[PDB]
Amino acid sequence: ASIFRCRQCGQTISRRDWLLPMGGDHEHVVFNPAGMIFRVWCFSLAQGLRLIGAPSGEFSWFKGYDWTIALCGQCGSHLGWHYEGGSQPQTFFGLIKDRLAEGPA
Amino acid sequence: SIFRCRQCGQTISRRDWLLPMGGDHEHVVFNPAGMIFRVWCFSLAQGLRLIGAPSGEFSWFKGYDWTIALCGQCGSHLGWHYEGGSQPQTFFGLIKDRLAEGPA
Amino acid sequence: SIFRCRQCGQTISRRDWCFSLAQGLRLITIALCGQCGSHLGWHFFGLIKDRLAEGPA
Ligand SMILES: Cc1cc(N)ccc1C(=O)N[C@H]1CCC(=O)NC1=O
Ligand SMILES: Cc1cc(N)ccc1C(=O)N[C@H]1CCC(=O)NC1=O
Ligand SMILES: [Zn+2]
Ligand SMILES: [Zn+2]
Ligand SMILES: [Zn+2]
């Protein structure tokens, strides 16, 4: 019973039970076109976020998925991205590990 | 999909250059210091600096000698170059979490 | 060459021992890693190879 909370405001976001091994690992170190590097943990589900914009396929780290920016729905901190439009799974979250705090349910 | 050094962005390898050694490009191995590594095998890499002389001692890959591979830019230890074997003669075993994957 | 739990590094088995002997498991048989409780296989010990790591003795 471990949960991940927004490090800025404490809202519960996801659960350790929901870690998802995308391509063999739940941890992906990635860089965007601006050269910013993120350590992303993949989760099946989340709550308490606000997904902003329409999904985009441009520069997706995960082939066959479109992404949307995920903010903490409470404080607006950028916590990662939601991925959709794929298969097995259809949808999942890539959340920035350093912006989360893990603790007891 | 390009692999860069996670510490500095040096260009290192490509997803196209992954090599399934023994049926898998990923090997999970431990050294005699008890460190566990998820090693990805690549046919080719660039931007590294190979340090020292090859050694067969404790090689995870039978028939190959290894040389330490640093990031040629920042000096971070990214893995090993393997040589002296067959099919292939040489390849790179890089530590997955010391790389960052992203756009070409 | 020694087989260890990939998740926590518990020693499980070796090259010399589908295994005939293992250590460090808890049989529930479903074989859990005794240390971290990862499902590593069943008891003949059958172990998920992808759930192991290999190194020197
Ligand atoms: C595409 C992009 C352009 C910018 N000017 C700044 C940032 C980004 C960015 O992080 N995009 C991310 C979105 C999620 C993903 O999968 N891949 C990406 O590169
Ligand atoms: C051989 C060795 C001795 C130490 N004192 C510390 C670390 C290491 C080490 O990582 N060696 C690696 C080199 C690459 C290989 O294939 N197998 C290994 O165990
Ligand atoms: Zn928040
Ligand atoms: Zn570097
Ligand atoms: Zn374990």
Author numbering:
A (entry chain B): 19 to 123
B (entry chain A): 20 to 123
C (entry chain C): 20 to 36, 60 to 70, 86 to 100, 110 to 123
Task: Reproduce the article's own wording on this structure.
Nowadays, the E3 ligase substrate receptor cereblon (CRBN), thalidomide’s primary target, is of particular importance in the fields of MGs and PROTACs. However, these CRBN ligands induce the degradation of IMiD neosubstrates and are inherently unstable, degrading hydrolytically under moderate conditions. In this work, we simultaneously optimized physiochemical properties, stability, on-target affinity, and off-target neosubstrate modulation features to develop novel nonphthalimide CRBN binders.
Halo derivatives 8d (R = F) and 11a (R = Cl) could benefit from both mechanisms, haloalkyl compound 11b (R = CF3) displays strong deactivating properties, whereas compounds 11c (R = CH3), 11d (R = OMe), and 11e (R = OH) have ascending electron donating features. The inherent conformational flexibility of benzamides 11 along the amide bond was investigated using a force field-based method implemented in Schrödinger MacroModel. As expected, IMHBs were observed in low-energy conformers, except for 11a–11c. Fortunately, we could study all compounds generated in this iterative step through cocrystal structures in complex with the hTBD homolog MsCI4.44 These data confirmed that the preferred orientation of the ortho substituent toward the amide NH was preserved in the bound state of all ligands except for 11b. Sub van der Waals distances ranging from 1.3 to 2.0 Å were seen in 8d, 11a, 11c, 11d, 11e, and 11f.
